[PDB]
Structure 1
């Protein structure tokens, strides 16, 4: 990920005017939609947390967790740490990123800071559900001037996205003020 770290703007867009900041969310959402589309229930939830982190979760299959034969780490870690621009760009430019994967009856958890995993992906428990959750805190060493998420920017885009992605339920929650929206277009 050092190539992204060296020139963040070339990968995410403008890091000073808020456009790159919001691009972080939309990159994660694109992955979540892809996950949601492969399942039959298809729901994603985007939450703006009070600490100005954002989490995106889907109830899909859960991204793969098995050890990659060549890389020697979990598939999820490979996706997060090897160079849409890819979620690895978001990970690189996040001061913290939490990953939770529910798959095959197991809960997998991992934490990253500035793209660096704090430990290997670990099975911490059991679950009856499936899905992936990523919560990230944009790096304040990279994102300057505009550092807080604008609800309207997210809601507008998620609304547009719902019409292209039929059957996918999209929820947006702002924990700073309690605002909620639900974008679900059932065409097709």
Structure 2
């Protein structure tokens, strides 16, 4: 399943060699935050281009479900991230690393994956007065070629579009490599 996506990344994510696929990975993650906004629960999304070749998407919604199936021992979060608008489990499969942090019901929950494989169970890392979901991922360098770094203007252009197609949601884009910041929101 996650092996199929790794074998033929182009089918799922788009071209792996000119940066189209690389940027679609961001948009896949954002679409879920936008859905949480369409359901009324998320007011703001923050997309950050980090200086270590990762992007993070943070929403202020209800947070991804964190409960465990008792007999299976697997959290809803882990199901969401590992099982097959191509979906976030594809992003996970094509990331050398992905970090999920969930603020929900007063607790911070966290899980790390490498190439889609979880490294430990979902775990509580603190308390919080907020809710939301944060996904931060480092794209796989076995998968992506030529364009292996995120490009501000490709995300800016698309995140503006999404801002105006889903009127009311605030989308912020931040680039840690040069301090560039933008704010997209339409009345």
TM-score (norm 2): 0.96
Contact 2:96 2:140 in 1 (8 A): yes
Aligned-residue offset at 1:7 = 0.8
Aligned-residue offset at 1:68 = 3.6
Question: Structure 2 stretches of 5 or more lacking a match?
Answer: none
Aligned-residue offset at 1:172 = 0.2
Partner of 2:153: 152
Contact 2:42 2:59 in 1 (8 A): no
Partner of 1:128: 129
SS in 1 for 2:164: helix
CA change 1:48–1:120 in 2 (3 A) is same
Contact 1:38 1:61 in 2 (8 A): no
Q: Deviations over 1:116-162 (max 9, x none)?
A: 11100001211100000000000001001110111000000011111
Q: Deviations over 1:54-105 (max 9, x none)?
A: 0000000001011146754100100100111010000000000010000000
Mapped partners of 2:66, 2:176: distance in 1: 30
Q: Deviations over 1:6-63 (max 9, x none)?
A: 1111100110110000000010110111123334561000000001200000000001
The count of corresponding residues between Structure 1 and Structure 2 is 186
State how 1:8-87 maps to structure 2 within 5 Å. 8-40=9-41, 42-68=43-69, 72-87=73-88
Mapped partners of 1:165, 1:62: distance in 2: 19
Runs of 4+ in 1 over 4 A off after TM superposition: none
Mapped partners of 2:183, 2:172: distance in 1: 5
SS in 1 for 2:162: helix
SS in 2 for 1:98: strand
Contact 2:36 2:42 in 1 (8 A): no
